[PDB]
């Protein structure tokens, strides 16, 4: 079964972690994938690997805060694969700090990448998806789009914001056969989080396994990291023709974090 | 093709009609062994037998979900027949629309007993089976009416709100036991229940059936369409599958954008 | 100085805890209060102490699960004070158990008192409030109306349901000068909770302080019990003429619990 | 009774609409109020009116996007009234358009004023409020912080974001006697909205009453505009010492909008 057979998916931040797994899993589902990241070296390598494995893949690097570059990356996608069926707004980063020590510029950058970048993508894929009366837009958000976490003023503001953007975008294209959803993971086993576990274990002087099980997963009822494979499986369902009635939703995959 | 529920036993309450019946047929196509449980023991036997004629593993285990003794025995019959319960779908329900002042208390209590207490009884009697095997999928068929209000639906919206409360408690109690508990929340599905309500509104208002649907039911639906039972079954398959082990405690919404505005 | 002057407040479960405080504080704001509880002797002495302080108080005991007694308690209020302006559906109780050890009858009872009780109160005051084009209904819920907690299947199901009833009721009287809101406290310093701290302290062989600071309040960002007066102050605001634009809301007072 | 006696309130955008009402109502409840807006003559005019009526008021204009100006306005307040007890992040604007014809720079501007402006305000009052272990921060949001509305990508993104910032901020100061809440009105009777009724009546060739009652209020159960007075009354309660237990909340007054 090829759930995304020949569907054209553009995935921002797809050179690492969740975005890279989505791209691999989408290709295996039969999607034509576009690897898009800051790092144009890792983009070209990723797309070349996929091509060598017999997949349709394109390197179209861009900074999602660079509207002109994001625009041309979509136009390159149209020229290569004819259309865009699926946009995954996945590009992001993290800066943890008390509000008092939280540089305004860093706050503005978290918002620009993870909110304005999503808005820029939606703005330039909407005409393609409305012309063909089909589309799937997934904004990679977080449970931090639904609840608060101390030290994450910029991240939680950006992810809250992309849930509002998701709902506005959904309402504007609900008649055009296009869905816009925010996939909200909890803690995922990624380089980023393995970094934070690394950080916690030195800064608290506990083991890597104690940093994970006693602090990172203390408020996770399943007491486990989500796999990138699980996130990509939900993304595949929402991006499929079978999820046409799901739109305007903060779709939560969090091992019960927000249930308590 | 693939069998997303291969090797799993699915007990589905209210599975002799509408959404329950589509879930049972689609779960079977995904390689689940399905138990058709409903009030109408006649339609259950016929449903299960028709599935069996199409090469599927189906059991007729009729019960009234408000009858804890009959529910417990329907679960026991499933264990005896298939060995275990992997997936419980709490889907049995009904509707009674009236202003609160003309809403009989007993009808309010019955709506709550069937759609809330019924889901509680099901959960209490599958939990030990699922916990001993460290695997389970519990889906409560709630509604967007579990998350928002609608005038005249005091009993329904009260039961469906409550079943989302019960989903969260259950999810927290079995989070470490490889069991998920979710509330699948449809908006308007093209079913007998809903086609009945369109006829009602069209009589009482003396508009045409298309007028009642398009001007009243679908006014609030951004997608301006009824969902298909197939769409609900497809979400139910994903949540009931091994692929969704990290989804729990959730009101999972498929509503054509209804709660987005 | 008198935010409820000339208003008639019917308060279920007002013989103890939050309901008792709401009755006393509502009287101070110039409301005529009906003390209604299971224990008729405590309703009489409460109403009498209030009367000795120059307040207008009526004893109207009932079991809120007894629609005939509830209906007769409302009728007696109409007979004595001319109308019901404010209904406080406050009557409740708690039973904590794993779902496996949770008796179905106890589950049903929790739902009958805290959901059905509320439906019965609302059904019998709505015609009175709709006739005068003025009402304030407050369903005393809990953050357990909004999130899950292990061992509270019955209570969390009842409280979730009363938020559902609250939004339905609100929509049905929105044009009639009536509001219907669910006040949702976190942990409040009441006999009920002081009981639960004493319980936890024996069960875990810890101080009363440790049971409170380290178990009860570990999920409360403010790390404190709410006072019954704080709950009463929010109840007075929502029950006052100044809150006519608040309806259909789960109004949360929880020292930040639901923010995490 | 003066509910904010001896409190200093800093209100951004207080030269007009909800902010102006909050300043005049906070003054009547005994707050020293700071009038801060873009319009510097209107702030001096407003503050002078309150002074003539026996009220403590200070003009301290600033663009909330100008962190250096906002920091100096908070400093001027410290110099004049000793401290800041209450911050009302109120400054906002609106721009309605489909995503495709929604200028990226306008989207950025809505977020910069209504999310980043609040971040800057919170960042510079938190050390003052933490030092004295007392504070009240109210971010004026909107039901558009909780649901989607077609054509308001920028506004709904910004309001969604400010609720995220509210929950983060609440968690960072929950132990410090500081509450952070987002007050979320539906349609309020303001120059802003009357403007919008004027536009709908003209661009749809219908009466002002047609355009309000049949279009703007179509999704409002109470079928009425809220008053600036109603918003101010909830703002006063939230900002009072009586609301110490309310924090990290999206506090909704929407005549039932979000109940359906
Ligand atoms: N990993 C988690 O635990 C977790 C939790 C919840 C949700 N998410 C969200 O999912 C997304 C994936 O994060 P991840 O874990 O894969 O992190 P990661 O660090 O592995 O990958 C992030 C990628 O984003 C790229 N990027 C950053 N800014 C960019 C920009 N302006 N334009 C283009 N590319 C840019 C980086 O180059 C990098 O390759 C993020 O938005 C994150 O907030 C992650
Ligand atoms: N149809 C929709 O648009 C829609 C939308 C949202 C929610 N739902 C929910 O999805 C579920 C399925 O709805 P539906 O319209 O297919 O059917 P329904 O709600 O009318 O009930 C379906 C089945 O439940 C059975 N049933 C009723 N009471 C029972 C009892 N006490 N014990 C056992 N079985 C009993 C009936 O015999 C029927 O076959 C229900 O919970 C409903 O509330 C439906
Ligand atoms: N205590 C808390 O921390 C807390 C937190 C969240 C919500 N609540 C809710 O607020 C309300 C008040 O709680 P409390 O702590 O003051 O409770 P409490 O147990 O101290 O007092 C409740 C009163 O209700 C009465 N009552 C019980 N069943 C009744 C019935 N069927 N009919 C009439 N009266 C009945 C009892 O006799 C008692 O006087 C309850 O609904 C409770 O669930 C309390
Ligand atoms: N109007 C409504 O019904 C409604 C409903 C929901 C929310 N709100 C919110 O309430 C608040 C007040 O709205 P209003 O109706 O009083 O509008 P208004 O236009 O009368 O008030 C807005 C004020 O903010 C000022 N302002 C704009 N940008 C600024 C900046 N960068 N720095 C400083 N001041 C700036 C303007 O000069 C103006 O005085 C806004 O945040 C708005 O989003 C309004
Ligand atoms: C959303 C949880 C998370 O992973 C935020 C972050 O640390 O990037
Ligand atoms: C949730 C839609 C529905 O099924 C309510 C009803 O029965 O009218
Ligand atoms: C003993 C529990 C309770 O107080 C319920 C009732 O009054 O019927
Ligand atoms: C916080 C809800 C509640 O009241 C649980 C309890 O009974 O202590
Ligand atoms: C309804 C919230 C609001 O005030 C947005 C607008 O219409 O300006």
UniProtKB/TrEMBL annotation, chains A, C, D:
Listed transmembrane segments: none
Binding site for NAD(+): 16, 18, 37, 63-64, 90, 92, 155, 159, 188, 190
Entries under InterPro entries matching the protein: 3-OHbutyrate_DH, NAD(P)-bd_dom_sf, Sc_DH/Rdtase_CS, SDR, SDR_fam
Gene Ontology molecular function, alphabetical: 3-hydroxybutyrate dehydrogenase activity; nucleotide binding
Entry annotated with the keyword Nucleotide-binding: yes
Keyword field: Nucleotide-binding
Keyword flag Nucleotide-binding: yes
Biological process per Gene Ontology, one example term: monocarboxylic acid metabolic process
Family label: Belongs to the short-chain dehydrogenases/reductases (SDR) family.
Protein name: 3-hydroxybutyrate dehydrogenase
Organism: Acinetobacter baumannii
């Amino acid at each position: 079964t090829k759930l995304l057979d020949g569907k054209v998916a553009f995935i921002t931040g797809s050179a690492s972690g969740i975005g890279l797994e989505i791209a691999k899993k989408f290709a295996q589902e039969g999607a034509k994938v576009v690897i898009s990241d800051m790092n144009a070296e890792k983009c070209q390598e990723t797309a070349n690997s996929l091509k060598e494995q017999g997949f349709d893949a394109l390197s179209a690097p861009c900074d999602v805060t660079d509207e002109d570059a994001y625009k041309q990356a979509i136009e390159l996608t149209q020229k290569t694969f004819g259309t865009v069926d699926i946009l995954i707004n996945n590009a992001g980063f993290q800066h943890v700090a008390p509000i008092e020590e939280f540089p305004t510029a860093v706050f503005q950058k978290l918002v620009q990448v993870m909110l304005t970048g999503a808005f820029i993508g939606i703005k330039h894929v909407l005409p393609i998806m409305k012309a063909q009366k089909y589309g799937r837009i997934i904004n990679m958000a977080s449970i931090n789009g639904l609840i608060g976490f101390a030290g994450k003023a910029g991240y939680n503001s950006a992810k809250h914001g992309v849930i509002g953007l998701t709902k506005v975008a959904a309402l504007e294209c609900a008649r055009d056969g296009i869905t816009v959803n925010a996939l909200c993971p909890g803690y995922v086993d990624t380089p980023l989080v393995r970094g934070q576990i690394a950080d916690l274990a030195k800064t608290r002087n506990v083991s890597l396994d104690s940093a994970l099980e006693d602090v990172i997963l203390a408020m996770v009822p399943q007491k486990r990291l989500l796999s990138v494979e699980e996130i990509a499986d939900y993304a595949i369902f929402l991006a499929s023709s079978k999820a046409g009635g799901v739109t305007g939703q903060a779709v939560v995959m969090d091992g019960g974090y927000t249930a308590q």
